[PDB]
Structure 1
Amino acid sequence: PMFIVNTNVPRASVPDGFLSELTQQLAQATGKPPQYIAVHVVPDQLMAFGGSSEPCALCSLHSIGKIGGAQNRSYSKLLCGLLAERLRISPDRVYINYYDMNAANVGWNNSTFA
């Protein structure tokens, strides 16, 4: 899994350890080892949600499997909770795109997975 957050929240408002927490919590939620988890946070973005420039976030979770109806609800509760608690972004100003990747379409270490 790979999780990306883009947000208009400033860099100074991202708390120390945020990437570590995302890594740890995503490992728990996906059942994948922490070593596999990639996390990417992009603050200070020029963005709007519903025509308002109040704090918001646009995110993606790519995973080889572990994506589906109930699972995605659970990820959204977890991730919106974190963005609310840590970045002070209201859950209703977050979008998260979920992508179930075929292993053959993920490159790593000079090759691809299967």
Structure 2
Amino acid sequence: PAAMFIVNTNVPRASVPDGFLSELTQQLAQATGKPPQYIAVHVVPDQLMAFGGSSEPCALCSLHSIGKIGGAQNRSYSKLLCGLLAERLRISPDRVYINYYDMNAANVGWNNSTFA
């Protein structure tokens, strides 16, 4: 039942608020319905990035999840996650892409095995 969220951004590290990784863990566990134990978060600041040819603040993100991915769900995750990047990192939501991936359990390794 794993899920993992990565955010890559040109915002500097010092502008990522204390607790951001915990907030992402908590809110993604609520949004996906998964226990927080199985949510992993990876935040990558200070990146060399451009969005539409502008180097103003932006983010490129991915959510990989075993299940809980689909049309309506992804719209709800995007409202949640773009809102968090706007409020916490001051990145405009129209300068964020988030790619969503529904992983088959047999294609996710954990603890010397897979979830298949």
TM-score (norm 2): 0.97
Report the 3-state secondary structure (helix = DSSP H, G, I; strand = E; otherwise coil) of the residue aligned with 1:77: helix
2: distance between equivalents of 1:64 and 1:37? 11
Q: CA deviation at 1:16?
A: 0.1
Q: Could you tell me how far 1:34 is from its partner in structure 2?
A: 0.4
Matched residues in 2 for 1:12 and 1:63: separation?
A: 29
Distance 2:101 2:49 in 1: 22
Q: Measure the CA separation in 1 of the matches of 2:66 and 2:39.
A: 12
CA-to-partner distance for each residue in 1:12-49, whole Å, 9 max, x for gaps? 00000000000000000000000000000000000000
Q: Which residue number corresponds to residue 10 of structure 1?
A: 12
> Residues 46-73 of structure 1: CA distance to partner in whole angstroms, max 9, x if unpaired?
0000000000000000000000000000
Per the TM alignment, residue 8 of structure 1 is displaced from its structure 2 partner at its CA by 0.1
3-state secondary structure, aligned to 1:83: helix
Shift of 1:107: 0.2
CA distance, structure 1, for counterparts of residue 38 and residue 101 of structure 2 = 16
Gaps of 5+ in 2: none
Q: Secondary structure at the match of 1:66?
A: coil
Segments ≥4 residues shifted beyond 4 Å:
none
Give, in whole Å, the separation in 2 of the partners of 1:102 and 1:31.
Answer: 17
Q: Give secondary structure in 1 for the equivalent of 2:7.
A: strand
CA positional deviation for 1:6:
0.1
- Unaligned runs of 5+ residues in structure 1 are none
Deviation, structure 1 residue 84:
0.1
3-state SS, counterpart of residue 51 of structure 1: coil
Alpha-carbon RMSD across the aligned residues, in angstroms, is 0.3
Normalising by structure 1, report the TM-score: 0.99
Q: Distance in 2 between matches of 1:34 and 1:65?
A: 15
